[PDB]
Amino acid sequence: MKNGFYATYRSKNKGKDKRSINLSVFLNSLLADNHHLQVGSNYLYIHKIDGKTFLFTKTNDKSLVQKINRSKASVEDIKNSLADDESLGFPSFLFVEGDTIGFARTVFGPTTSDLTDFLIGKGMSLSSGERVQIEPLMRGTTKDDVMHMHFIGRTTVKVEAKLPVFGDILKVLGATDIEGELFDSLDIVIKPKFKRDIKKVAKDIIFNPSPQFSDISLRAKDEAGDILTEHYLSEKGHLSAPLNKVTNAEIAEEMAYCYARMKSDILECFKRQVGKVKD
Amino acid sequence: MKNGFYATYRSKNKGKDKRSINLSVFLNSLNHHLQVGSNYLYIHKIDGKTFLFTKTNDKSLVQKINRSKASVEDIKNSLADDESLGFPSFLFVEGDTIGFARTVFGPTTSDLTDFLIGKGMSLSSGERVQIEPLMRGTTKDDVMHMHFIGRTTVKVEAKLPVFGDILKVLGATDIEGELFDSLDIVIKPKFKRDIKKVAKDIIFNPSPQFSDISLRAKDEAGDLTEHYLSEKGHLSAPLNKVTNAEIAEEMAYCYARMKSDILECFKRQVGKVKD
């Protein structure tokens, strides 16, 4: 699945007077009387998986719309269904945490643009001239995608303290006794000079068949003309993988895990790109 | 010399509202003396982004400076230790940050705030000018009396041999060191755990594998403070036989190195300053 982390808020144009959309409260209040929102020829549904994670599905197949309306019992317990059965439509997955979200979509699952329309059509309260915004903060990438990147700048290599290479790096700096119980992790922030492309080193570390990292964040351009964008990558890709026997609740655990790993980066991104949100 | 890296802004609304003081513009617009009681403060440019900031209460020295009217070139080549302009501090300016280094009798960052204010920096209602420490310089000596060391960042300029050693460990077998500025090893302990052993082992390596280190730490017991430590020292060393211009070169060179680290302690400790 393609995955990313986003800010959410509603605001005047040019991001003036950003305010929280209370996304968890909003969505949780919709569940008791749960119906699709139709948008053009598309039908969109939200269903809870657990406290922080929702299943966001989409279809334009009227016979699937029919089956969902008549399968009221299959509709209410989905936490332990296979994600790839697509009984509720093409799936995307939404992890909610205050003014930030995590979001993962299958090939045909709904988009954050769809999610914006869902929130409008479901009755997001909005002043005149106020609109809902879902702002990308970081994008999840894979190893083959990294190999096609046009430009790579600052690359940050995160090493959990349990990795052997963690003790290697401290030792070469002069550490004689590393008590792993004291440490969470270390980061190697590899900073280019000027706007120089360090994609050869960055690619060499990321494609190492003996990966010496737990996670990697890098600033990159996919193509010429793209904006410098923060990407993240897990050694255990997990969320990149195909669905295959995974259950909706297992994806929601993967996402809470991913958000915990990245939370420090997320809020860093949040405060620079977005600024403050009330509340 | 006592020295540090600071953020500068105009602050109001419980400190929530922070506005740029545009310090380079303001200083370059200045009339070199302010008398504050029986003291006199003096700013003159040295070179580029560094200004000389001095203090005296000898009235006769003040009238001599005023008539002499020392040229930019005269001040650059002056012995820094000579105090023919008063007891010196040094002020490097870039955007909303400063490097600031004072001699034991040089003016302080309150003196500097005094000087900007008495020279007509404009304030709004309930607004104050603030120079906020981001990173205080320290020495290997001082680290020795430190009994708690938290998160710790090892800066490695790309010229050091351990830069390529580290990259190869991670699997990089084709390093064009000219592409690179440096790397940082950010060492993160578990919640509030004390990692002074690994930290001191690195800092006190008789064959240092670093260019600079910054760390969160408390000197004695009961006090987290962001410190930084430079291979060489230079600024931390006393004002001997060096010139104001040489200090300025050091100021600039030190700032250029730490730039990354200052700009992050910025966004963490102060956040956003509207410009």
Author numbering:
A (entry chain B): 1 to 279
B (entry chain A): 1 to 30, 34 to 226, 228 to 279
Report text from the authors:
RexA and RexB function as an exclusion system that prevents bacteriophage T4rII mutants from growing on Escherichia coli λ phage lysogens. Recent data established that RexA is a non-specific DNA binding protein that can act independently of RexB to bias the λ bistable switch toward the lytic state, preventing conversion back to lysogeny. The rex genes are situated directly adjacent the cI repressor gene in the λ genome and are transcribed from the same PRM maintenance promoter that drives constitutive expression of the repressor during lysogeny. They produce a 31 kDa soluble protein, RexA, and a 16 kDa protein, RexB. Here, we have shown by X-ray crystallography that the λ RexA protein has a split, two-domain architecture that shares structural homology with RdgC.
The resulting structure, however, was incomplete and was thus used as a search model for molecular replacement to solve crystal form 2, which refined to 2.05-Å resolution with an Rwork/Rfree of 20.6%/25.1%. The final model shows a symmetric dimer that measures 95 Å along the longest axis. Each monomer contains a split globular domain (residues 1–139 and 248–279) comprised of a seven-stranded antiparallel β-sheet flanked by α-helices that is divided by a dimerization domain consisting of a four-stranded antiparallel β-sheet with four α-helices localized on one face (residues 143–234). These domains are connected via two flexible linkers that we term the hinge loop and the swivel loop (235–247). The β-sheets of the dimerization domain pack together to form a continuous eight-stranded anti-parallel platform above which helices α6, α7 and η1 interdigitate. The globular domains are situated below the dimerization domains and have only minimal contact across the 2-fold symmetry axis via the C-terminus of the α8 helix. This helix kinks at residues 261–263 and interacts with strand β11 of its affiliated dimerization domain, anchored by a salt bridge between D215 and R261. A bound sulfate and two cadmium ions from the crystallization solution provide further hydrogen bonding contacts in this region in monomer A. The sandwiching of a cadmium ion between two monomers at the two-fold symmetry axis produced a significant change in packing relative to crystal form 1, which ultimately yielded the high-resolution diffraction. Superposition of RexA and RdgC shows that the orientation of the globular domains in the crystallized RexA dimer occludes the space beneath the dimerization interface, blocking the formation of an analogous pore and preventing DNA from associating in the same manner. Based on this modeling, we predict RexA undergoes a major conformational change that reorients the globular domains to facilitate DNA binding.
